[PDB]
Amino acid sequence: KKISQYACQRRTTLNNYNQLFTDALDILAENDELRENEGSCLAFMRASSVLKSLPFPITSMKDTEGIPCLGDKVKSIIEGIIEDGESSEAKAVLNDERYKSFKLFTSVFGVGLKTAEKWFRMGFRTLSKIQSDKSLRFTQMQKAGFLYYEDLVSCVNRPEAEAVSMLVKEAVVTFLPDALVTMTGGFRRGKMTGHDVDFLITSPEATEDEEQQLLHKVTDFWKQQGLLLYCDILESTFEKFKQPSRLDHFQKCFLILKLDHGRVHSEKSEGKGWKAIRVDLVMCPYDRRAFALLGWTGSRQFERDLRRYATHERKMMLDNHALYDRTKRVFLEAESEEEIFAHLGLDYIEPWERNA
Ligand SMILES: [Mg+2]
Ligand code: NA
Residue 171's domain is classified under what CATH number? Predict the structure, then answer.
């Protein structure tokens, strides 16, 4: 079978046979991410990712005897799961207070490690003592992250997801009827839930100016109707010929939308009417659209390896907008995702086989 070490040469759907180990590794892994420990975090991810791809549940250390990205520091945490049935380590981090406050604080829109650590040291340990504290100061992001904390913690359905997609179209389609709005990210990977609904937008006719102002024009429109609860519009920071660095994104746009419950058709058929929704819009040149999709579809690990594989194996540089060959000193183009995979010389993996 020979299991590639790269997630991009692996098929990882949503059929995990090793959640037991997986959530242990993601916990331990996510802990080093909060522990500013960039190195061990990697280890756990590679390992966790790998397992998520296995077609069977590991029931003994013998089953490990082949898989890659399986280091000692790890098999030891694995061996504990196999026996105890649970993880002493994993369980520990769960109780660690620093961890717990970092997760909890960080779970607020506008809150990252910086501000997370800030509040920790100040002795804060809850979001109630944080909001109420008549001293601290908050960004508009944090105000918005807090103001709608409740709904944002809640997952987002495909119903709700699709519900948003209509909205994102009736708008975009209005200012650029020759534009394609495709849902990206996790839902595009086959997931039943997610925390933000992503969309990549592109247009053939779209001009520089047009493809630019479009994003404002849409949010304007949402503002005029009280659906825009938050909005941050970063202008593109990409030059066309700026090869993949060994930031730099298109005009993206983070925001919270007011999803009116009446527009969501689900098996469920109220208090406010609506639900706050995190939404990301990415605008992109029609000619680079194939890299943005590959760039905006899952997953961290898939994207992570796609890149290291690209470099370390093909002396090529993959981007969210280009694919440069350092050898042929030429920029490869792709009218599709399949082409890109083709270029890197990889069997095509589907969006749902990308949940590495
Ligand atoms: Mg996003
Ligand atoms: Na956050």
Answer: 3.30.460.10
Residues with CB under 5 A from ligand 1 (ion): 280
Q: Print burial letters for 214-247: b (CB count within 10 Å at least 16), e (below 16).
A: bbbebbebbeeeebbbbbeeeebebeeeeebeee
Please indicate, yes or no, whether residues 37 and 86 belong to a single structural domain of this protein. Answer: yes
How far apart CA 15 and CA 21 sit, in angstroms, is: 14
Q: How many residues does the chain have?
A: 356
Tokens, residue 315: 């002396």
Domain span at 318: 287-355
- Residue 329: CB atoms within 10 A of its CB come to 7
User: Which of 73, 95, 117 is the C-terminal boundary of a domain?
Assistant: 95
289-302: b or e for each residue (b if 16 or more CB lie within 10 Å)?
A: bbbbbbbbbbbebb
**In contact, 310 and 318? CB cutoff 8 Å:** yes
Q: How much distance in Å is there from the Cα of 337 to the middle of ligand 2? A: 30
What CATH number is associated with residue 28?
1.10.150.110
| 144 vs 231: CA distance, rounded Å | 10
* Structure token digits, residue 26: 């993601």
Total domains in the chain come to: 4
* Ligand closest to the CA atom of residue 106: 2
Judgement on whether residues 258 and 164 belong to the same structural domain of the protein: yes
What separation in Å is there between the alpha carbon of 116 and the centre of ligand 2? Answer: 9
The single residue of 198, 260, 325, 347 carrying the catalytic annotation is: 198
Q: Does residue 282 share a domain with residue 159?
A: yes
Domain boundary among 132, 154, 176: 154
3-class SS at 133? coil
Is 280 marked active-site?
yes
Question: Domain with 331 in it: what CATH number?
Answer: 3.30.210.10
Indicate which residue of 63, 232, 280, 325 is catalytic. 280
Experimental method: X-ray
Q: What is the resolution of this structure in A?
A: 3.0
